[PDB]
Amino acid sequence: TRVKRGYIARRRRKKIRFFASSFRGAHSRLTRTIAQQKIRALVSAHRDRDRQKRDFRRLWITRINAAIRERGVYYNYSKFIHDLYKRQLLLNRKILAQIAILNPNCIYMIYNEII
């Protein structure tokens, strides 16, 4: 019994093609390239989601460090964290970084409660 390839190669490649919507040039038009790039996109996505966690953290240190140098001279981020664990606080970088922008008056009180 003879069996043509049929349509399984077509319906497969449409799923591979639909993922390549906004790609420029021949990376959205040629099947032998979209399969070559669709592989690369997910690896880059799986890699970024691991880097996604360290990146926002890296941004929160700057914002918290940037928002606290104004209070005291010869004072800095590293001294602020050492006092929280001394005072037995639990707040993380996410909450402190967002309060620094959204309710800056709170950190001025947190600095006072520590001292």
Partner RNA sequence: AGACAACCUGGCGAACUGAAACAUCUUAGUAGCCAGAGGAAAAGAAAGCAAAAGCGAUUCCCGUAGUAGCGGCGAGCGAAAUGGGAGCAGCCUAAACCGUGAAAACGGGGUUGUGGGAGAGCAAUACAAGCGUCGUGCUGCUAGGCGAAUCAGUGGAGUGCGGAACCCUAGAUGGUGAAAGUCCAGUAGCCGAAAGCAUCACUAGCUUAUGCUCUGACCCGAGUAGCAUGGGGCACGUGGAAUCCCGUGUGAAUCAGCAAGGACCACCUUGCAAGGCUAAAUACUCCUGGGUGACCGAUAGCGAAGUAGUACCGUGAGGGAAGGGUGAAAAGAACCCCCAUCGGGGAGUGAAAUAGAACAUGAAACCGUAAGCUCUCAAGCAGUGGGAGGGGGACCAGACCCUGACCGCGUGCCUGUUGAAGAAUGAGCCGGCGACUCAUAGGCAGUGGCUUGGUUAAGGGAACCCACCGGAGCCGUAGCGA
Partner RNA sequence: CGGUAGGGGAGCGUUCCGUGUUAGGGAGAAACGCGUGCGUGAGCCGCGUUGGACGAAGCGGAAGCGAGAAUGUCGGCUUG
What residues make contact with RNA under the rule CB under 7 A? Answer: 1-15, 18, 21-27, 29-33, 35-37, 39-41, 44-45, 47-49, 51-52, 55
The rounded distance, in Å, linking the Cα atoms of 104 and 31 is 53
Give the shortest CB-102-to-RNA separation in angstroms. 15
Specify the residue, 11 or 86, whose C-beta has the smaller distance to RNA.
11
Judged by CB, which is closer to RNA: 9, or 109? 9
Question: Residue 34 Cβ, how far from RNA at the closest point, in Å?
Answer: 8
User: Cβ 73 to RNA, closest distance in Å?
Assistant: 30
String of DSSP letters for the chain: -----TTHHHHHHHHHHHH-SS--GGGGT-HHHHHHHHHHHHHHHHHHHHHHHHHHHHHHHHHHHHTTTTTSTT--HHHHHHHHHHHT----HHHHHHHHHH-HHHHHHHHHHH-
21 versus 88: smaller Cβ distance to RNA: 21
Nearer to RNA, 16 or 81 (CB): 16
